[PDB]
Structures are given as structure tokens and as C-alpha cells.
Design an enzyme around this catalytic site. Structure first.
Site, PDB file in Angstrom:
ATOM      1  N   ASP A 107       0.767  -1.205   0.487  1.00 32.88           N
ATOM      2  CA  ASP A 107       0.171  -0.045  -0.067  1.00 32.88           C
ATOM      3  C   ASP A 107       0.795   1.702  -0.230  1.00 32.88           C
ATOM      4  OD1 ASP A 107      -3.087   1.099   0.399  1.00 32.88           O
ATOM      5  OD2 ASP A 107      -1.871   1.959   2.226  1.00 32.88           O
ATOM      6  N   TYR A 155     -12.201   8.124  -2.350  1.00 32.25           N
ATOM      7  CA  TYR A 155     -11.957   8.203  -1.094  1.00 32.25           C
ATOM      8  C   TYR A 155     -10.713   9.297  -0.652  1.00 32.25           C
ATOM      9  CZ  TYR A 155      -8.496   4.810  -1.525  1.00 32.25           C
ATOM     10  OH  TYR A 155      -7.136   4.403  -1.440  1.00 32.25           O
ATOM     11  N   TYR A 238      -1.350  10.991   2.812  1.00 27.91           N
ATOM     12  CA  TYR A 238      -2.636  11.435   1.534  1.00 27.91           C
ATOM     13  C   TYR A 238      -2.355  12.848   1.043  1.00 27.91           C
ATOM     14  CZ  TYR A 238      -4.720   6.622   1.393  1.00 27.91           C
ATOM     15  OH  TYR A 238      -5.040   5.138   2.206  1.00 27.91           O
ATOM     16  N   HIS A 296      -7.173  -6.436  -0.012  1.00 32.54           N
ATOM     17  CA  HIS A 296      -6.231  -5.553  -0.499  1.00 32.54           C
ATOM     18  C   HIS A 296      -5.131  -6.041   0.902  1.00 32.54           C
ATOM     19  CE1 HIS A 296      -3.866  -1.849   0.512  1.00 32.54           C
ATOM     20  NE2 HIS A 296      -4.525  -1.733   1.588  1.00 32.54           N
TER      21      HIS A 296
HETATM   22  C1  LIG Z   1      -2.907   6.911  -9.833  1.00 32.84           C
HETATM   23  C2  LIG Z   1      -2.518   6.734  -8.250  1.00 32.84           C
HETATM   24  C3  LIG Z   1      -2.070   4.975  -7.944  1.00 32.84           C
HETATM   25  C4  LIG Z   1      -0.416   7.239  -7.906  1.00 32.84           C
HETATM   26  N1  LIG Z   1      -3.094   7.465  -7.353  1.00 32.84           N
HETATM   27  C5  LIG Z   1      -3.864   8.657  -7.515  1.00 32.84           C
HETATM   28  C6  LIG Z   1      -3.551   9.829  -7.261  1.00 32.84           C
HETATM   29  O1  LIG Z   1      -2.757   9.513  -5.676  1.00 32.84           O
HETATM   30  C7  LIG Z   1      -2.812   8.026  -5.182  1.00 32.84           C
HETATM   31  C8  LIG Z   1      -1.155   8.211  -4.499  1.00 32.84           C
HETATM   32  O2  LIG Z   1      -0.462   6.682  -4.322  1.00 32.84           O
HETATM   33  C9  LIG Z   1      -0.975   6.224  -3.707  1.00 32.84           C
HETATM   34  C10 LIG Z   1      -0.832   4.401  -2.888  1.00 32.84           C
HETATM   35  C11 LIG Z   1      -1.047   3.175  -2.497  1.00 32.84           C
HETATM   36  C12 LIG Z   1      -2.806   3.728  -1.915  1.00 32.84           C
HETATM   37  N2  LIG Z   1      -2.865   3.409  -0.796  1.00 32.84           N
HETATM   38  C13 LIG Z   1      -4.745   3.069   0.118  1.00 32.84           C
HETATM   39  O3  LIG Z   1      -5.523   4.003  -0.513  1.00 32.84           O
HETATM   40  N3  LIG Z   1      -4.894   1.707   0.167  1.00 32.84           N
HETATM   41  C14 LIG Z   1      -6.014   1.619   0.942  1.00 32.84           C
HETATM   42  C15 LIG Z   1      -6.827   1.444   2.806  1.00 32.84           C
HETATM   43  C16 LIG Z   1      -8.069   1.942   3.047  1.00 32.84           C
HETATM   44  C17 LIG Z   1      -9.131   0.952   2.058  1.00 32.84           C
HETATM   45  C18 LIG Z   1      -8.889   0.965   0.857  1.00 32.84           C
HETATM   46  C19 LIG Z   1      -7.226   1.252   0.216  1.00 32.84           C
HETATM   47  C20 LIG Z   1      -3.468   5.213  -2.050  1.00 32.84           C
HETATM   48  C21 LIG Z   1      -2.812   6.377  -3.022  1.00 32.84           C
HETATM   49  C22 LIG Z   1      -3.081   7.000  -5.816  1.00 32.84           C
END
Ligand SMILES: CC(C)(C)N1CCO[C@H](COc2ccc(NC(=O)NC3CCCCC3)cc2)C1
Ligand SMILES: CC(C)(C)N1CCO[C@H](COc2ccc(NC(=O)NC3CCCCC3)cc2)C1
Ligand SMILES: [Mg+2]
Ligand SMILES: [Mg+2]
Lengths: 319, 319
Positions: A107, A155, A238, A296
């Protein structure tokens, strides 16, 4: 697979910045292997890997990432940009006297270890990610719209404004982790309707059942950990999309030349496998693993498959 | 030689018994090398060895022994018998997931690592002692008279009764460590007249000069450490002679079959070199080192010679 009792581990503490120390647990001897968990988790998310890797001949360092558990959780949002997090992890290695380490992440931890591979290859012996692909930064697309382009990342907008998600996630920590730590066929939430419903859990059970993946005792350990510093620090991972975007852009044009492993989970409906489909073009020595029937929460959904994939890869491409 | 700044180390904590945790500092990668200090010292007594060994390819674990520094200091005198101290050090390895370690010790730490070699050879990859010889237990001579046989060990009687030595050693901690940590040609005390003079320092300067071996800053670090738990715990290592005698006797008849190194110091007037003269008969693979112009405080008197001796031995007989 053999799990971990937290009071029977060796705990290590490293200060990387004046008010920031990283906590980790250390088991085994051999090449250093640094495990980096995701959101919203713990070193303990690796409980099924730590004794297995040690038994295979590796020195495991399972991190409490910054903002989590026993690691420091500085208040500033920008301390959780990917650039400061990596440079702190280099200092981590420096202070431990490790020239390199194998890095394995999941993640957000998987995102971190890709960036450690990309910008600090000299310090990464090899790198593996669970679920998280490596996708080169697009210098022509802001991060905001690339979220609005895929409603699944809805989210992350809800996560943006400080204090909003913290209140929901902290209002009932047992409800929080029993609602999150679930197998795909057991899920009780839609990441689509969050900003339209006003929260992650508002349509979820108030007293959720206990996933087949976890015990009440294991839930209560996470609950204990998150009473320490709460969710602001973790959520802050985030809240640096544009910072992380600009830094990632500063790399463009270079491939990751070190041994690498991408592990996909067939029922991760957010970090879907196809998001990884052209990593080979940017990572020449990339090897793959894939886990069927895996949601996940890769390390606890399918610990045995994870352990097998990791140990086979470590023995062939990390030593 | 490169020394250590305490706030830039990785600190590790392992719980071995309900109320006993051991602290250590960890630097480097490679075969595990456990350093065990003497009386009355600290992990920091190894400050000149820790970076040198790590740079030579070893993973260094420098202990705060039980009773010292950041390690637990249980109140009971019998918790510092050699038998409980070793079994705790085996648990240490167990909880860290280390099958074996090289053990290197000095003064009481050197006594400890010999007994770890003697009773737990399966867990000791190799063993080295500074100054402290290994002398098989004499099942016909009590420890009391074997002290009365050599007037040099007179101070160990003064150390026997709880609270007596603690008051003297704790009355002025800076005076204590500047009076102790000195080169042989600088010494300001006689271990002969102690029980006849009523103390270690009563004939020593009240404001002692600062040995050429140490800075005021390094003295103040020891001083800081010993404000934490005082001298009872450390002194208790001396208050188990008959217990340690009976346990040592339970071994008689077995040789130490693992690679070993005895390092003698020419001007240690208490742990004199000749006390080691027939260790070969009990330790078949014993190799030797000897340091001229070296007093009791081996690691800081002659750091470079120590480092050279240790690294040459580690590379030939420990890997
Ligand atoms: C295009 C991309 C891929 C770059 N995107 C969009 C722009 O920015 C984000 C930044 O990168 C990440 C990297 C990992 C996560 N992990 C996550 O969200 N895990 C959750 C936990 C709670 C339940 C659901 C799952 C999130 C974002 C990603
Ligand atoms: C016969 C023998 C050798 C077994 N004897 C007699 C009976 O019992 C003791 C027990 O063994 C040890 C082992 C190490 C030490 N170290 C020590 O005293 N360091 C001092 C610090 C302060 C300044 C002067 C030096 C003492 C005793 C020894
Ligand atoms: Mg392609
Ligand atoms: Mg002989």
C-alpha cells in the site's frame, strides 16, 4: 504460519530528525530486509512474514512508519510527503550502519519503497511491493483530476481536509479496524459513495462482524496502537499529492535498474492488478508474483502465499 | 579511532524476564558480534570498537549489561549470579532470532562470555575476552580464601556488604569515574589498602585530574548513566562468588571447543597476564593477543591495538 507476540520481539529505535524517531522490530540474521506497511496499519501487519523471513536466513526490520504506533508522529502535514519520508529512511540506514537493505512494502509502504528504489538505488539491495504498482509521474496531469478520472479513488478526496476523516476513523477504533481488515468477499463499504455519503462507514454496520482473517485480539492490538497518536499522521500520507507529484516528476527519464518484484492481488478492487501492466518498460529486471483470491490486506489474507513468493524471490534475486 | 555519539545510535530493547529488559546499541551488517562491558562501565566503553567492527563487516550489538545504563536493574543480589546472567543472554539471542553470536567481553563481561562459551557453546560462534582469564573452578577451594590468598583482590571484600561500596561510589560520581578511568602510570589508588583504609578513594585526590585517556564530556556520559540506577546492580556482580563457584563446578571436566581469543594487558595490575598462562590446556583452539603499555581500561587505553587484534581474529576464526 507462525505469527508474532508483540512483547517477545526486540524493539529498535532510531532518531532520524530532532523530534522524529522511527520504531521497528528486528528478527533474524542475514541480509537486511526492511518491511514497510500501508494505511492504516503497523509493523504488526507483517506478523506472518517476520518469523518466516528470519527462518529463511534474513535479518528482518519491520517498521512502524512515521505517524504510526511507537514511531514519532510530527504534527506538520508536509512531514509526510514522500520526499521527506524516503530521506528519513536513508538516515535510518545510515544510523544503523547498513550500506543497503532489501525493501518490501505494501500500500503506501509499497509506494515508499518504489521511490526509495527510484531515487536511492545505491541504498536498496532489492525492492518488492505488494499491490501498489509503480507508475511514472505524468508531468502534464495534476493529481486532483487523475483522482477525478477514476471514481475508485474518491475516498482520497474525503481524506484531504484535516480533521474530517480523523473524527470518523477515531470515533470507534474497534469498529474502524473490523470494518477495514476484511476479505474482499466480506467487505462492508464502497469507496465510491464516500464523498457522496459523507464518510466511509455511514452505511456500514455499527457492530461489524469479525473477518475470518483476524482475531479479536489482533484487532485490539491495532486499536491499542492507534490510541497513541491517532489518525492524523497516517492520513497525512494522502495529503501531499501535489508535493509528491512534483518530486516524482524530477526523476522522469530514469529506469529502476535494481532487482524488483511486483506482487498483485486478484481481488484488490482499488490497487487492481492491471494498474501494473507496463511496469516492465520502466523496471527492466522486474519479476512478478500474483495471488488469486486475495483482497487488499495481502499479508493477512494470504500469508503463506506471500511468504512463499517473497522467500523464493529473496533467495534468487537478493543474495 | 572513530568514536560514538550516543544520540546517533540505533537503540535496541529486549525483554528477557518479566521485569528485566536489556538495552543495546546496534551498528553494522554481517555476523552478529555481542560486546559485553565490565565494572563499572557501559556499552559506551566500546565506543572505539563499535564503528571499527561495523566497518570491517560485522553487525555489532553493544550491551548495557544488567544493572547498567538503560538496562533493567532488578533489586535482588542473586539476579546477578553468572548463571542467571548467561541464561538471560541466551534468551537475548532467542528473542532476536540469532542462532549464535560472537561474544567479546572485558572484565566481568569477559568472565560472562567465557561462561557463555563453556555452558552454551552451541550459541557462541566464537569468544574473546579482554584481560579476564578463564580459570576452571577449583572444587576444593572456597572463593573467600582464594581472595585472601591474593591481597590484590582485597577490594572485592569491601564490595561484599550491600550499601557500603554504593555510598562511596555514588557520593561524587565525577570523582568516581575520573579516579577509576586512568592509565596505569596515572593511577591514584591501591586495591591493597582498601579494607584497611576503609574505602577505595579515601587516600585519593578529592578533585582528581583528568586522565589522558578520556575527556570531561566522556566522563559526564558515564556520570549520566549511573544516575539512573546507581551502583548496587553493578556491585552485585561481585556478590555471587559462592553461587558462581558452585555453578562453575558443575561444568568441570569439559573444554571450550569453539574458536577463542585471550587478550592480555601488560599493565593491568589486577587481571595480570600470567593469570592466563595455562588456558590452552582447557581451550584447545585458543589464540592470543597481548597489548604492551595497556592498563585495565583496555578499550580506551589502546583502542587501535584492540581494534586490530579483534578484526584480524574475527576475520580468520569467526567467519
Ligand atoms: C494514480 C495513483 C495510483 C498514483 N493514485 C492516484 C493519485 O494518488 C494516489 C497516491 O498513491 C497511493 C498509493 C497507495 C494507496 N493505498 C490505499 O489507498 N489503500 C487503501 C487503504 C484503505 C482501504 C482502501 C485501500 C493510495 C494512494 C494513487
Ligand atoms: C580468582 C578470580 C580471578 C576468579 N578471582 C577471585 C575470586 O572471584 C573473582 C571473580 O571474578 C572476577 C572477574 C573480573 C573482575 N574484574 C575487576 O575486578 N575489575 C576491577 C574494576 C575496578 C578497578 C580494578 C579492576 C573481578 C572478579 C576473581
Ligand atoms: Mg511495455
Ligand atoms: Mg599447559
Amino acid at each position: 504460519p507462525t505469527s508474532c507476540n508483540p512483547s517477545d520481539m526486540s524493539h529498535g529505535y532510531v532518531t532520524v530528525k530532532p523530534r522524529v524517531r522511527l520504531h521497528f522490530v528486528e528478527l533474524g540474521s542475514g541480509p537486511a530486509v526492511c518491511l514497510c506497511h500501508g494505511f492504516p496499519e503497523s509493523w504488526y501487519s507483517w506478523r506472518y512474514q517476520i518469523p518466516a523471513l528470519a527462518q529463511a536466513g534474513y535479518r528482518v526490520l519491520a517498521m512502524d512508519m512515521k505517524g504510526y504506533g511507537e514511531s514519532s508522529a510530527p504534527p506538520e502535514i508536509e512531514e509526510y510527503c514522500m520526499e521527506v519520508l524516503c530521506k528519513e529512511m536513508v538516515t535510518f540506514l545510515d544510523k544503523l550502519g547498513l550500506s543497503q537493505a532489501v525493501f518490501i512494502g505494501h500500500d503506501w509502504g509499497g509506494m515508499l519503497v518504489w521511490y526509495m528504489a527510484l531515487f536511492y538505488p545505491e541504498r536498496v539491495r532489492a525492492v518488492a511491493s505488494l499491490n501498489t504498482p509503480f507508475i511514472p509521474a505524468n508531468p502534464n496531469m495534476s493529481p486532483l483530476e487523475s483522482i477525478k478520472a477514476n471514481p475508485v479513488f474518491d475516498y482520497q478526496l474525503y481524506f484531504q481536509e484535516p480533521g474530517v476523516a480523523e473524527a470518523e476513523l477515531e470515533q470507534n477504533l474497534s469498529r474502524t479496524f473490523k470494518s477495514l481488515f476484511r476479505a474482499s468477499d466480506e467487505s462492508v463499504l464502497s469507496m465510491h459513495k464516500v464523498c457522496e455519503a459523507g464518510g466511509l462507514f455511514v452505511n456500514s454496520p455499527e457492530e461489524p462482524s469479525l473477518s475470518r482473517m483476524v482475531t479479536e485480539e489482533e484487532i485490539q492490538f491495532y486499536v491499542q496502537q492507534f490510541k497513541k497518536s491517532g489518525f492524523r499522521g497516517p492520513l497525512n500520507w494522502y495529503r501531499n499529492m501535489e508535493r509528491n507529484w512534483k518530486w516524482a516528476c524530477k526523476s522522469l527519464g530514469r529506469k529502476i535498474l535494481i532487482p524488483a518484484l511486483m506482487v498483485t492481488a486478484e481481488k484488490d478492487f482499488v490497487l487492481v492488478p492491471q494498474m501494473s501492466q507496463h511496469m516492465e518498460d520502466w523496471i527492466p529486471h522486474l519479476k512478478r508474483g500474483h495471488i488469486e483470491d486475495c483482497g487488499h490486506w495481502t499479508q493477512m489474507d494470504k500469508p503463506t502465499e506471500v511468504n512463499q513468493i517473497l522467500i523464493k524471490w529473496l533467495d534468487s534475486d537478493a543474495r
